[PDB]
DNA sequence: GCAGACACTACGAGTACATA
DNA sequence: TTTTTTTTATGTACTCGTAGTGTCTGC
């Protein structure tokens, strides 16, 4: 087991950061009439850990005993789709975006059957069951419009803990029906404290310089920070303050793609960059993360009077990418617009 | 007995009563008088006389054997893959004793509605039994008929009827029905017909039944002026970035009760064949499609069409 | 070492068809008393128990309390290749990761061995309270299957009522209500047709239809069926499958409407 | 003795408990007396009481024993195709009106079809409702509920009497929240209830959820403004002043720093758009700068409503306001 | 006797003399009926103009109550109208004669734009072949969704929007039949907010009479929620006469006090900017910006930011208009 | 209060299987004289007039006159699971929607109460002319079903003629023609198999084979059918049920136009 | 009288496409 | 002088394969 899963806290009193929020979440779920929750924040902030802590607070220690259940759902086109589900004896965990645009068929048929049925054992299980819908910002708007009356009608016997990264992709009818719980990313000091605690529980000594560099390179992602720290011990156990931290391959590929964009501004270079963007889209990197990495590396090469135009173009083509269906058109359109703007700026 | 309307009452029964497309109709008259007619597909606008020409040719060729030597199939029939295999081929194989130069005629009216597979199955029964049976297809969109069938038949194309050609038939119907008229009323009937004899006869019948006299006011009280001639002036105003007259035409079309979808369809149909720059035409078509997506989404107001007109005027002054 | 032999091959060929579309896996618990299966469905509505005692097997070897987890998508295809009146032997080693089913071919000339991978599932026993039910009735099995099938054409959910008069099935839909009753069937020659009442307190609860049809897919295993209900306990459907053991079905009720004032 | 959340616990059972929607409540109170109920189309912002009003009206008209026989409720949680409209809705609308109230209260001689969240229905399924509404109007009534009335076709808009549910005013929302807190033995300060009705913005469901959650968090003591700001997701004013100072400085690196600091703090982009809009319209900038900045704010809000990435939209808005604040220097 | 009916269904023009507006079309159709020369009709127009009422009045005039079920086949979008229906019941109804008494039959296809084009292409020879036996009436709102071959075979009547001058006496008849106290400003508000649609006129009249008990301008504009003309004039004067903050405060106070929506404000301001003598470059910018704002309101967007953008669209053009001089 | 009692369930099954693909919905008109049902088809081409007498039922009571419009697919699903030898009770209240069908199982033990919800169709009453016909033919129903099935293989529309000689059937199809002419078949030992001619003036009319084949499904109701034909009034197929009532089928002729030549 | 064989329609299922 | 594959979400239409099932033949 990796360090991301070995030293994860179990209860709300064992969290290393957001302790006031942990006490407030303990006070919220004590009575049992707590509303639907919408846990949102950046990735790696600790949202899933706090959701499981809330579940362990509500139920016993049997929440952590999980299983995989596969359900076959019939579409209106009568094409059967099998969807996996993390399940326990007290709660359910569905990621409906695995059914893609059929996610509404998950909401309209599989969820309501959970909601319309009462619990078998009201002594062990409580008066309500909890369903965790993972990544509700990746849901289509039809699934979110199918969610709302199921949330309203069966609230007393079925609670929902939706989890997302951005609440801007959640429709206002769903956001009106649930309490929004914000989990910010841990600070550099919090990540340094967590990494030092993990290293001392592992019997290792971690310097403050290496912990600060891991926290800064992780971009306040504690999962990536723990994975980078474990990779650093693996590759070199004596922790030097200037030890090289390993990096992900797609980030370096994106940086070299942006360097190739900067190096030449020609349709042949645009063809090569389009090949690099297909390579990135092939490896299941989301196109918004490709846009963000492209902007973050292209702004390091622009001058002071071009960065605002580059950022506005990146936001515009990201919006057009979200409105469309083929990401390569909007990605190559952003690269071609940047090439035209950069050529105009360099020649004049 | 119930008297038929003038579209069905004054359907021509001989090929010399069909006006318009004079060379093709004359060659069909020669073929009806002589015989040995090839396979024929007539394409053209609605109301031109394609069904009338095919039925008159079949009647003049067959005479008294029309009941047993003709197979007429419509879009109201099945005519799927199982009917071309089993019914059309069995009629093509069927023995019918006919005079010299005369063959069995399989009329396939409105041949756009036939699927691709039925037209593929039609090919070899067209080619094999051609010494005993012939085919006479009528259609509107000639691209719906596949290229082997168009190669297996003579493709006759009917053009839209002119003003004098419809005026001759209208004079014949008026002299038959003793309808009083003026020249301006007949010009208004031609104007509302737009090359369609069915609409000309329907508008003449409606005006004569409603008012009993054909002048311009009685025609325009019940009939309507055509849409794209008025849309073309608005598109011409949008080309010169004249937003006031374009909105005047748009608001006049709005207060007449036309939906945004019909108006934007007429705008697109005018902008397809308008006489302007090609890059400006593509900019106009892209802006029209962008507005039509909003119309199809649900936001369809007068402000949205005015914004479309303003964006089309912006496309002029943006090089 | 787990090594068991069956006396009839039709027991598995009638008990796995009810679990084909009901539960996604079969977890067998091995003990000296017998084999116990407790499986909850993916929607947390239905609960299947199957206790087959060791006295009913042709032979039974069990040294350690072991638990095996098999899938249904492969066992359902394996069971159709098996025969009907042949013998089925189940074999499982102490440290191996596969379960072997050895039987006779339907051509009755060769022995067929089929191996299935053991799914390592992490479940816990939910725990039935085994409390005193407010209504216990006994019904014919095939008649109960025909009753559950006849309400499928009317509504998507059924209503079970049980007073001292008998058991009332209702199906209210957009078409119209379908109400049937069974009462006082002691004056018949067959002992399995005895529709009897055993308790006092009446109960009225709305249940699903699909899960009851899946429950009545296991009807020719037993002769009679038993139905147990209470005010809040889920519906218990009991089959006494011959001599080797018994099967229990638990079905949770639906959420009642707001009919108060 | 199960606990139920206060959104469902304080749902209006009768139309007298519906707040601030005086015209439609007056229409339904007249229809309770025996007046002719027309076809209804409720539309407005979320949490204004469109579902509660029609459910309370149906409960008052039919009672407990006739709700299952006279009301057909269909929302987007179940399938509503064109075949569901052609088969299920038409066969419900063609039935006779039978059953009488046993408590002696009068019963209206029609059924009610509640097509809640009618935005999600397709245009063909909405076109299939037209002669069903017109022909069967003697024995049934239709109440379409939506949030955007432009998603419902013009014939169905013409056939239904339209009622727009306004957002709840601060007086009525504060009165309802204080009555709920008085019924729950909860003490709340004047500043706390004022910031609560400021934050909720006419959404009474959001206000009741915030009041219940602030009651559960404090344990039963007095709800102050600090608890409301903690639970409301309100960005602190120092972050807004830092964003404006970074855009005033004209350096894009400070702009990226404050945008990454706001993204890493988990703040919603719509909340930042609202607070930056309030700061911009309550500033001493010129009319042209305020004009472009508010236009960019509206475009950014539209892009966030279409599910664009928050970081790029906020960095574009920050670049626009940086250009506006650095042009005049 | 009395019935519990909506006023758009309680007051339906059962005869052709009770419809108000399309007098030349109704006279022509009445002379079609009297001369027994009824053709295949195509009634098209905006909603609420009286096309279904026209064809039902014509069907009731042509046929008696003892034979109405055998002569009229009425199909709409609530019924299945696929190509199997055109080849099935419709073709068998067209190709057979009547049961009880001799006569020509009538096939009414209400909402004919919702039919598939396969069904519309199958309808063509059914209409043409059995013209003497049966008549067809297509009714649509969108003429572009009906194929040109079906538009050729039918004589088309445009049922345009109801003019407010002819709209008044039918509303006065409904008012006198329901004992409604209405002022002249209330009738003016009814015929203004209806906009050529008798359905919404009667719906707004019934809603106002139930909500308030009287029908005046204040009661109509309160029950509908529509802003008055003076409110829109004040909003335009605030946007064109003062700075961003004061206009924003005044418009926000007016919207909070009266409970106005931004869609109706956008509609009335769009109607106002074509009346105000703007320069053509200003008018194009205003129309483009207002169309953008109206498109942004169709999704989950905050209305306060869109109101600020509406103020911004005029605060941009203020200096341009004044410096144009 | 309406309470009719069909003495056996077979007649209602044959009636509702005759009308299943033809009638859209059943309008039972209830009086003290009996049960009347005048309903057109979905195409408005055929007409069904069923009259059941009060003396044919086991018990028949009717206080006030009713007119119950009910769905036919629901009643078909109700009558599918009904026996042919059991009593069937039709119940209806004064101001309710439940039309109750009460019968017994084929196991003949449990009761079955199937409710239906009445519709509101308020259709106007269609006037049967009840005039004299120029041709009346008594013929067996099985021979009529056989000749309609044989003519369905050749064409789709069948010219039926009748004169002083007898009834004649013609089907000019795509394979060719089929002309079957039957007369004076009264010289058999049976009494049902006989062709009798009553009226004078010859008539030739063309009808669709689909509606005739739907009309022939009432063959088990009556052993002998009557055909009424005239030049203006439609074709009537009259089945006289033995001790319950009668059934009239009205079919309109097709429009045929001669060649201009 | 009851098992085997014949064609019959209802139903499941796969695929295409939708404009001028 | 150059060719492989499944996504888009419903609604309709076409085409083909399969399965209860009513009825006829025979010992
Ligand atoms: N060229 C013509 N000369 C005289 N009458 C004509 C002519 N074309 C059409 N008509 C009249 O219009 C009626 C309809 O003509 P059709 O031949 O059926 O139309 P069509 O050419 O087949 O167009 P479509 O595509 O089938 S709608 C005829 O019955 C005539 O009364
Ligand atoms: N006007 C109101 N009067 C009283 N309680 C209200 C009102 N509006 C909302 N509430 C409360 O908030 C809850 C939500 O009300 P709803 O009727 O569901 O709002 P809504 O109009 O349906 O919002 P949408 O459009 O469905 S997201 C209700 O159950 C009440 O507890
Ligand atoms: N010209 C009219 N004269 C009198 N009442 C009218 C008129 N037009 C509409 N109405 C009223 O509006 C109701 C509905 O009108 P319809 O006849 O359904 O109009 P419509 O043209 O069919 O609208 P669509 O396109 O079907 S939504 C009628 O029952 C009348 O109460
Ligand atoms: N309070 C904490 N103390 C120590 N480690 C934590 C804490 N919270 C989260 N983590 C670790 O950081 C990682 C965050 O991942 P996760 O909990 O899934 O959050 P998110 O859902 O936001 O990605 C987890 O792997 C967890 O082990
Ligand atoms: Mg034609
Ligand atoms: Mg709601
Ligand atoms: Mg209509």
Q: Are E252 and E307 in contact (CB under 8 A)?
A: yes
Q: Is A125 helix (H, G, I), strand (E, B) or coil?
A: coil
Using a CB-CB cut-off of 8 Å, the residues of chain E touching B77 are 87
Report the interhelical angle of B260-272 vs B227-239 (nearest 10°): 70
Return the bridge partners of C179, or none. C170, F113
Q: Which residues partner with B71 through β-bridges?
A: B106
Check whether residue E152 and residue E15 sit in a common domain.
yes
Which residues 184-243 of chain B have a CB within 8 Å of chain E?
196, 198-199, 202-203, 205-206, 209-211, 221-222, 224, 241-243
**Residues making up the binding site of E for ATP:** 45-52
Let me know the angle formed at the C-alpha of A305 by A299 and A306, rounded to the nearest 5 degrees: 45
E199 lines ligand 3 (CB under 6 A): yes
Closest C-alpha among F10, F12, F45, F8 to residue F26: F12
User: DSSP 3-state assignment of E152?
Assistant: helix
Question: Could you give the angle at the alpha carbon of E75 between the alpha carbons of E69 and E78, nearest 5°?
Answer: 125
For residues B95, B97, B101, B105, the Cα torsion angle rounded to the nearest 10 degrees is -50
Among residues E208, E226, E244, which one ends one of the domains?
Answer: E226
SS3 assignment for chain C: CEEEECCCCCCHHHHCCCCCCCCCEEEEEECCCEEEEEEECCCCCEEEEEEEECCCCCEEEECCCCEEEEECCCHHHHHHHCCCCCCCEEEECCCCCEEEEEEECCCCCCEEEEEEECCCCCCCCCCCCCCCCCEEEEEEHHHHHHHHHHHHHCCCEEEEEECCCCEEEEECCCCCCEEEEECCCCCCCCHHHCCEECCCCCEEEEEECHHHHHHHHHCCCCCEEEEEECCCCCEEEEECCCCCEEEEEEECCECCCCCCC
- How many independent structural domains does chain E possess? 3
CB contact at 8 A, A227 and A214: no
Q: What are phi and psi of A159, to 5 degrees?
A: -100, 150
Write the CB contacts of E38 (distance below 8 Å, at least 6 apart in sequence).
E29, E32, E58, E62, E104, E135
Structure tokens at E247: 């206009």
Domain that holds residue F111: 1-256
Q: Report yes or no on E323 lying in a domain.
A: no
Residue D90 has a CB neighbour count (10 Å cut-off) of 18
Ligand 7 centroid to Cα of residue D328, in Å, is: 60
Length of chain A in terms of residues written: 348
Domain regions of chain B by residue span: 2-161, 162-225, 226-317
Query: E73 and E136 share a domain?
Result: yes
- Specify whether the CB–CB gap between D113 and D142 falls below 8 A: yes
Neighbours of B217 (CB within 10 A): 11
User: Are E158 and E191 contained in the same domain?
Assistant: no
Query: How far is the C-alpha of B256 from the C-alpha of A275, rounded, in Å?
Result: 54
Burial class (CB in 10 A: 0-12, 13-18, 19+), F101: buried
Among A32, A115, A177, which Cα is nearest to D11's?
A177
Alpha helices (runs of H) in chain E, residue ranges in sequence order:
7-10, 23-34, 52-62, 68-71, 83-85, 91-95, 117-129, 148-153, 164-178, 184-194, 198-211, 217-224, 229-241, 244-258, 262-273, 280-296, 303-324
**Residue E229 CB partners (closer than 8 Å, separation 6+):** E268
Question: How far from the centroid of its chain's Cα atoms is residue F180's Cα?
Answer: 24
Domain B226-317 has CATH 3.30.70.250: no
Distances in whole angstroms, Cα of residue E307 to Cα of each of A131, D298, E256, F94: 39, 9, 12, 60
Instruction: State the residue for tokens 């009086």.
Output: F31
Of E124, E91, E138, nearest to B113 by C-alpha is E124
Rounded-to-integer distance, Cα F63 and Cα D15, Å: 41
Distance CA F66, CA F2 (A): 8
CA angle A282/A288/A291 to nearest 5° reads: 90
CB within 8 Å of D160: residues ≥ 6 apart: D38, D39, D40, D41, D133, D142, D144, E203
Question: What angle do helix axes E262-273 and E280-296 make, rounded to 10 degrees?
Answer: 160
Number of Cβ within a 10 Å radius of residue B35 = 15
Residues of F in contact with C181 (CB under 8 A): 110-111
How far, in Å, CA of E224 to CA of E186, rounded?
A: 12
Cβ neighbours of A61 (radius 10 Å): 9
D11 lines ligand 2 (CB under 6 A): yes
- Residue B175: how many other CB atoms lie within 10 Å: 9
Nearest-angstrom CA–CA distance, C47 and C249:
6
Residue E194's domain is classified under what CATH number? 1.10.8.60
For residues A28 and D216, the answer to whether their CB atoms sit within 8 Å is yes
Pick E93's closest partner by Cβ from F43, F123, F250. Answer: F43
Please give the span between the terminal C-alpha atoms of chain E, in angstroms, as a whole number: 68
- E307 close to E284: Cβ distance less than 8 angstroms: no
How many whole angstroms from its chain centre is CA D166?
A: 10
Last residue of a domain, one of E182, E204, E226: E226
What kind and span of H or E run contains B26? Answer: helix B22-34
CATH of the domain at E130: 3.40.50.300
Question: Quick one: CA dihedral B156, B160, B164, B167, positive or negative?
Answer: positive
Sequence-distant (6+) residues with CB within 8 A of A111 are A94, A131, A147, A150
Q: Is residue C261 part of a domain?
A: no
* Tokens found for residue E288: 């483009």
The minimum-distance atom of ligand 1 relative to the CA of B169 is 4
Asked whether residue E60 is domain-assigned, the answer is yes
- For chain B, state the CA radius of gyration: 24
CA of D130 to the centre of ligand 7 (A): 7
The DSSP secondary structure of D71-137, one letter per residue, reads: EEEE-TTS---HHHIIIIIHHHHTB------TTS----SSEEEEE-STTSS-HHHHHTTHHHHHHTT
The DSSP result for chain F, as a single string, is: -EEEEES-SHHHHHHHHHSTTTBSEEEEEE-SSEEEEEEEBTTSSEEEEEEEESTTSSS-EESS-EEEEEESHHHHHHHHT--SSS-EEEEE-SS-SEEEEEEE-TTSSSEEEEEEEPB---PPPP-------SEEEEEEHHHHHHHHHHHHTT-SEEEEEE-SS-EEEEEE-SS-EEEEEE-----SS-SSS--EE-----EEEEEEHHHHHHHGGGTTT-SEEEEEE-SSS-EEEEEE-SSSEEEEEEEPPBP------
- The terminus-to-terminus CA distance of chain F in angstroms comes to 65
CATH number where C70 lies: 3.70.10.10
Q: Is D197 helix (H, G, I), strand (E, B) or coil?
A: helix
Name the token pair of E77: 């979008």
Q: Are E106 and E66 found together in one domain?
A: yes
Instruction: For residues B212 and B209, give the distance between their C-alpha atoms in angstroms, rounded to a whole number.
Output: 6
Rounded alpha-carbon distances, angstroms, from residue A185 to A181, A188, B105, D309, D315: 13, 9, 81, 18, 19
- Please tell me the distance from the alpha carbon of residue B299 to that of residue B297, in angstroms, as a whole number: 6
How far, in Å, are C175, D83, F119 from residue C153 at the CA level?
9, 18, 20
Q: What is the CATH number of the domain that holds E250?
A: 1.20.272.10
C123-149 core/surface letters (b: 16 or more CB in 10 A; e: else): beebebeeeebbbbbbbbbbbbbbbbe
Q: How far apart are CA F71 and CA B223, in angstroms?
A: 45
In a domain, E103, yes or no: yes
Which residues fall within 8 angstroms of residue D71, CB to CB, at 6 or more apart? D58, D62, D111, D112, D113, D114
Residues D116 and D145: beta-carbon distance below 8 Å: yes
Q: Are residues E148 and E209 in the same domain?
A: no
- Report the distance separating Cα E4 and Cα A121, nearest Å: 49
* Domain tally, chain F: 1
Query: What Cα–Cα distance (Å) separates residue A119 from each residue in A115, A122, C47, F197?
Result: 10, 6, 11, 75
Residue D223 DSSP symbol:
B
Nearest C-alpha neighbor of E189 from the set E151, E156, E217: E217
Query: Nearest CA to A317 among A341, A336, A296, A302?
Result: A336
How far is it, in rounded angstroms, from Cα C11 to Cα C25?
Answer: 18
Task: Yes or no: say if A276 and A260 are a contact pair by the CB < 8 Å rule.
Answer: yes
Residue F261 in any domain: the answer is: no
Strand G proximal to B198 Cβ, under 7 A = no
Distances (CA, A) of B181 to B177, B178, D260, E155: 12, 9, 81, 20
Tell me the nearest-neighbour CA distance from D127 into chain F, angstroms: 22
Same domain flag for E19 and E141: yes
d(C-alpha F250, C-alpha D127), whole Å: 35
> Cβ–Cβ contacts within 10 Å for residue D7, how many?
24
Q: Is E148 helix (H, G, I), strand (E, B) or coil?
A: helix
Overall CATH class of domain B2-161: alpha beta
The Cα–Cα gap between F45 and F215 comes to 13
E122 CA: nearest nucleotide by C1': H13
Across the interface, which of D64, D68, D91 has its CB nearest the CB of C260?
D64
Query: Residue E217 is part of which domain span?
Result: 163-226
Dihedral pair phi/psi, residue C27, rounded to 5°: -110, 115
Using CB atoms within 10 A of its CB, is residue C95 exposed (0-12), middle (13-18) or buried (19+)? exposed
CA distances from A170 to A96, A165, B130, E151 (A): 14, 10, 67, 46
Q: What span, in angstroms and rounded, lies between the C-alpha atoms of D322 and C13?
A: 75
The continuous run of DSSP H or E covering A113 comes out as: helix A112-116
Is residue E9 in a domain? Answer: yes
F2 within domain boundaries: yes
CA distance B166 to B191: 11
CA dist E27 and B295 (Å) reads: 36
Q: Which residue matches tokens 């003629």? A: F161
Method of elucidation = cryo-EM
- Asked if residue C42 is part of any domain, the answer here is yes
Residue for token digits 């934007």? B264
Residue E195 lies in a domain: yes
Instruction: Establish if F202 belongs to a structural domain.
Output: yes
State how far the Cα of E320 lies from the Cα of B307, in Å rounded to an integer: 20
CA distance B312 to B237: 10
- Inter-axis angle of helices D287-305 and D310-327, to 10 degrees? 170
Q: Measure the CA–CA gap between E159 and E46, rounded to whole angstroms.
A: 7
For residues C185 and E28, give the distance between their C-alpha atoms in angstroms, rounded to a whole number: 76
Q: How far apart are CA A181 and CA A175, in angstroms?
A: 11
Q: Which of F189, F192, F149, F144 is nearest to F167 (CA)?
A: F144
| Structural domains present in chain A | 19-182 (3.40.50.300), 249-347 (1.20.272.10)
Question: For residue F89, what are the β-bridge partners?
Answer: F5, F102
What is the number of other CB atoms lying within 10 angstroms of the CB of residue A242? 7
State the pairing for strand pair F245-251/F46-53.
Answer: antiparallel
Q: Give the F window 43-62 contacts with E, CB below 8 Å.
A: 43-45, 47
- The dihedrals phi and psi of D300, each to the nearest 5 degrees, come to -65, -40
Chain H positions with an atom below 7 A of a protein C-beta are 7-16
CB B88 within 8 A of CB B126: no
User: Which residue in the block uniquely carries the two structure tokens 């009414």?
Assistant: E108
B12, B26, B43, B52, best to mutate for ligand 1 pocket (most atoms within 8 Å of CB): B52
Length of chain D: 329
Closest among E4, E8, E57, E35 to E206, alpha carbons compared? E8
Quick one: tokens of F163?
A: 């004169």
Resolution for this experimental structure (Å): 2.8
* Other C-beta atoms lying within 10 Å of the C-beta of residue B95: 6
CA distance B2 to E38: 10
Residue nearest to atom 8 of ligand 4 (CA): A46
Domain B162-225: assigned CATH number: 1.10.8.60
Q: What is the signed CA dihedral for A221, A222, A223, A229, rounded to 10 degrees? A: 110
> DSSP assignment of F131-169, as one string?
---SEEEEEEHHHHHHHHHHHHTT-SEEEEEE-SS-EEE
Q: How far is CA A51 from CA A137, A164, A300, D117, D218, in A?
A: 17, 12, 38, 30, 21
User: What is residue A48's DSSP assignment?
Assistant: H
In this structure, the number of other CB atoms found within 10 A of the CB of residue F149 comes to 13
- How far, in whole angstroms, is CA B255 from its chain's centroid? 29
Q: Which two tokens stand for residue D305?
A: 């409503």
Q: Whose CA is nearest to atom 29 of ligand 1?
A: B11
Of B40, B110, B118, nearest to B76 by C-alpha is B110
Structural domain includes residue C202: yes
D125, D132 contact by CB (below 8 A): no
Residue of E312, E321, E323 for testing the chain D interface, max D β-carbons within 10 Å? E312
Question: Which of these, E4, E54, E3, E46, lies nearest to E28 by C-alpha position?
Answer: E54
Hey, CA dihedral for B13, B15, B19, B20, is it positive or negative?
positive
Name the nucleotide with the smallest C1'–CA separation from D83. H11
Q: Kindly list the distances between the CA atom of residue B19 and the CA atoms of B209, C70, E202, in Å, as whole numbers in the listed order.
A: 25, 82, 51
Spatial distance between the Cα atoms of D121 and D129, rounded to a whole number of angstroms:
11
């Amino acid at each position: 087991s990796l360090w991301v899963d070995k030293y994860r806290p179990c209860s709300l009193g064992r969290l290393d950061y957001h302790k006031e929020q942990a006490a407030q979440l303990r006070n919220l779920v004590q009575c049992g009439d707590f509303p639907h929750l919408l846990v949102y924040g950046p990735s790696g902030a600790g949202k899933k850990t706090r959701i499981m802590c809330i579940l362990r607070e509500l139920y016993g220690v049997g929440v952590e005993k999980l299983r995989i259940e596969h359900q076959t759902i019939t579409t209106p086109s009568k094409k059967k789709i099998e969807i996996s589900t993390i399940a326990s004896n007290y709660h359910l965990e569905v990621n409906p975006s695995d059914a893609g645009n059929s996610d509404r068929v998950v909401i309209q048929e599989m969820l309501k059957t959970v909601a319309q049925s009462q619990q078998l054992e009201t002594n062990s299980q409580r008066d309500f069951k909890v369903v965790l819908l993972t990544e509700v910002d990746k849901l289509t708007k039809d699934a979110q419009h199918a969610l709302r009356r199921t949330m309203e009608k069966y609230m007393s016997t079925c609670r929902l803990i939706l989890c997302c990264n951005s609440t801007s992709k959640v429709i206002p009818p769903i956001r009106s029906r649930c309490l929004a719980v914000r989990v910010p990313a841990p600070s550099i000091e919090d990540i340094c404290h967590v990494l030092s605690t993990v290293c001392k529980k592992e019997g290792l000594n971690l310097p403050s310089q290496l912990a600060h560099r891991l926290a800064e390179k992780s971009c306040r992602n504690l999962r990536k920070a723990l994975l980078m720290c474990e990779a650093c011990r693996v590759q070199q156990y004596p922790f030097t303050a200037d030890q090289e931290i390993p990096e992900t391959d797609w980030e370096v590929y994106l940086r070299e793609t942006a360097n190739a964009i900067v190096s030449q501004q020609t349709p042949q270079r645009l063809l090569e960059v389009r090949g690099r963007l297909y390579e990135l889209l092939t490896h299941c990197i989301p196109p918004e993360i490709i846009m963000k990495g492209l902007l973050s590396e292209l702004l390091h090469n622009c001058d002071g009077q071009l960065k605002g135009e580059v950022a506005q173009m990146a936001a515009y083509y990201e919006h057009r990418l979200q409105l469309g269906s083929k990401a390569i058109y909007h990605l190559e359109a952003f690269v071609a617009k940047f090439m035209a703007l950069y050529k105009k700026f360099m020649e004049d | 007995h119930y008297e038929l309307p003038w579209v069905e009452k004054y359907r021509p029964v001989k090929l010399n009563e069909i006006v318009g497309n004079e060379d093709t109709v004359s060659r069909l008259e020669v073929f009806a008088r002589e015989g040995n007619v090839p396979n024929i597909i007539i394409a053209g606008p609605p109301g031109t006389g394609k069904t009338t020409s095919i039925l008159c040719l079949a009647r003049a060729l067959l005479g008294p054997a029309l009941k047993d030597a003709m197979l007429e199939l419509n879009a109201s029939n099945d005519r799927g893959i199982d009917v071309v295999r089993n019914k059309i081929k069995m009629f093509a194989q069927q023995k019918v004793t006919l005079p010299k130069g005369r063959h069995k005629i399989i009329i396939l009216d409105e041949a756009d509605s036939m699927t691709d597979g039925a037209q593929q199955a039609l090919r070899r029964t067209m080619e094999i039994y051609s010494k005993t049976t012939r085919f006479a297809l009528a259609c509107n969109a000639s691209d719906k008929i596949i290229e082997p069938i168009q190669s297996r038949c003579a493709v006759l194309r009917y053009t839209k009827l002119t003003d004098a050609q419809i005026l001759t038939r209208l004079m014949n119907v008026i002299e038959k029905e003793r309808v009083p008229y003026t020249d301006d009323g007949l010009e208004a009937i031609i104007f509302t017909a737009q090359g369609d004899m069915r609409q000309a006869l329907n508008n003449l019948q409606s005006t004569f039944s409603g008012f009993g006299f054909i002048n311009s006011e009685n025609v325009f009280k019940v009939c309507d002026e055509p849409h794209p001639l008025l849309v073309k002036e608005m598109i011409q105003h949008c080309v010169n970035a004249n937003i006031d007259e374009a909105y005047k035409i748009l608001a006049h079309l709005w207060h007449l009760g036309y939906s945004p979808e019909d108006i934007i369809g007429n705008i697109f149909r005018v902008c397809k064949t308008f006489q302007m720059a090609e890059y400006l035409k593509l900019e106009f078509i892209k802006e029209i499609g962008y507005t039509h997506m909003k119309i199809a989404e649900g936001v369809n107001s007068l402000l949205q069409m005015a914004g479309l007109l303003a964006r089309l005027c912006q496309k002029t002054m943006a090089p | 070492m787990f090594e068991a032999r069956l006396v009839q091959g039709s027991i598995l060929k009638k008990v796995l068809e009810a679990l084909k579309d009901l539960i996604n896996e079969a977890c067998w618990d091995i003990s000296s008393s017998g084999v116990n299966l407790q499986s909850m469905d993916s929607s947390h509505v239905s609960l299947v128990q199957l206790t087959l005692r060791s006295e009913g097997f042709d032979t039974y070897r069990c040294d350690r309390n072991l638990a095996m987890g098999v899938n249904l998508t492969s066992m359902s295809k394996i069971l159709k290749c098996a025969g009907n009146e042949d013998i089925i032997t189940l074999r499982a080693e102490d440290n191996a990761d596969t379960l072997a089913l050895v039987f006779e071919a339907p051509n009755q000339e060769k022995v067929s061995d089929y191996e299935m991978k053991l799914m390592d599932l992490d479940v816990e026993q939910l725990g039935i309270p085994e409390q005193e039910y407010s209504c216990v009735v006994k019904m014919p099995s095939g008649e109960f299957a025909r009753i559950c099938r006849d309400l499928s054409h009317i509504g998507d959910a059924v209503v079970i009522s049980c007073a001292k008069d008998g058991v009332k099935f209702s199906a209210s839909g957009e078409l119209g209500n379908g109400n049937i009753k069974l009462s006082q069937t002691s004056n018949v020659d067959k002992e399995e047709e005895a529709v009897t009442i055993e308790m006092n307190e009446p109960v009225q609860l709305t249940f699903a239809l699909r899960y009851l049809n899946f429950f009545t897919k296991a009807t020719p295993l037993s002769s009679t069926v038993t139905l147990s209900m209470s005010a809040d306990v889920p519906l218990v459907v009991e089959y006494k499958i011959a001599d080797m053991g018994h099967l229990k079905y638990y079905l949770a009720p639906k959420i009642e409407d707001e009919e108060g004032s | 003795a199960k606990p139920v959340p206060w959104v469902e616990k304080y749902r209006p059972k009768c139309v007298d408990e519906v707040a601030f929607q005086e015209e439609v409540v007056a229409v339904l109170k007249k229809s309770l007396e025996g007046a002719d109920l027309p076809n209804l189309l409720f539309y407005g912002p979320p949490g204004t009481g469109k579902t509660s009003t029609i459910l309370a009206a149906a409960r008052e008209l039919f009672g407990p024993e006739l709700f299952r026989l006279r009301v057909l409720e269909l929302n987007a949680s179940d399938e509503r195709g064109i075949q569901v409209v052609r088969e299920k809705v038409k066969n419900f609308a063609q039935l006779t009106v039978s059953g009488s109230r046993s408590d002696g209260k009068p019963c209206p001689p029609f059924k009610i079809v509640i097509l809640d969240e009618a935005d999600s229905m397709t245009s063909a399924a909405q076109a299939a409702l037209r002669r069903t509404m017109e022909k069967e109007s003697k024995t049934t009534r239709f109440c379409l509920i939506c949030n955007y009335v432009s998603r419902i076709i013009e014939p169905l808009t013409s056939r239904c009497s339209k009622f727009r549910f306004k957002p709840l005013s601060d007086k009525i929302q504060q009165q309802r929240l204080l009555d709920i807190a008085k019924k729950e033995n909860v003490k709340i300060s004047d500043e706390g209830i004022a910031y609560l009705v400021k934050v909720s913005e006419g959404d009474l469901r959001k206000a009741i959820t915030f009041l219940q959650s602030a009651t559960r968090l404090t344990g039963g003591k007095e709800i102050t403004e600090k608890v409301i700001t903690d639970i409301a997701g309100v960005i602190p004013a120092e972050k807004i002043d830092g964003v404006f100072a970074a855009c005033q400085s004209g350096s894009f690196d400070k702009l990226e720093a404050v945008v990454k600091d706001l993204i890493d703090e988990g703040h919603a982009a719509t909340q930042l758009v609202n607070q930056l809009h309030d700061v911009v319209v309550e500033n001493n900038l010129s009319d042209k700068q305020k004009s472009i900045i508010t236009e960019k704010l509206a475009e950014v809000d539209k892009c966030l409503a279409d599910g664009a990435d928050e970081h790029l939209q906020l960095i574009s808005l920050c670049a626009t306001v940086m250009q506006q604040l650095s042009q005049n220097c | 006797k009395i019935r519990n009916l909506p006023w758009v269904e309680k007051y339906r023009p059962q005869t052709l003399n009770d419809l108000i507006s399309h007098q030349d079309i109704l006279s022509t159709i009445q002379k079609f009926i009297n001369e027994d020369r009824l053709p295949h009709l195509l009634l098209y127009g905006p909603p609420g103009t009286g096309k279904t009422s026209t064809i039902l009045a014509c069907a009731k005039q042509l046929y008696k109550d003892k034979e109405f079920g055998s002569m009229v086949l009425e199909l709409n979008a609530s019924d299945d109208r696929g190509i199997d229906i055109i080849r099935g019941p419709i073709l068998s109804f067209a190709s057979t004669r009547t049961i009880f008494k001799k006569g020509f039959k009538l096939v009414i296809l209400d909402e004919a734009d919702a039919m598939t084009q396969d069904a519309q292409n199958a309808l063509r020879r059914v209409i043409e072949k059995f013209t003497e036996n049966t008549r067809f009436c297509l009714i649509c709102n969108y003429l572009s969704k009906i194929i040109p071959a079906l538009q050729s075979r039918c004589t088309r009547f445009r049922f345009g929007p109801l003019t407010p001058e002819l709209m008044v006496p039918r509303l006065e008849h409904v008012v006198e039949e329901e004992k409604v106290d209405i002022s002249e400003d209330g009738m003016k508000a009814l015929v203004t907010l209806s906009s050529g649609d008798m359905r919404r006129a009667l719906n707004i009249l019934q809603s106002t009479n139930m909500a308030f008990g009287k029908v005046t301008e204040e009661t109509v504009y309160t029950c509908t929620g529509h802003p008055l003309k003076s409110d829109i004039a004040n909003i335009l004067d605030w946007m064109l006469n003062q700075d961003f903050t004061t206009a924003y405060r005044n418009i926000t106070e007016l919207k909070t006090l009266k409970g106005l929506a931004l869609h109706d404000i956008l509609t009335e301001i769009h109607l106002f900017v074509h009346r105000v003598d703007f320069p053509s470059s200003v008018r194009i910018h205003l129309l483009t910006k207002m169309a953008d704002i109206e498109y942004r309101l169709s999704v989950g967007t905050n209305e306060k930011i869109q109101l600020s953008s509406l103020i911004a669209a005029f605060q941009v053009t203020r200096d341009l208009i004044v410096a144009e001089a």
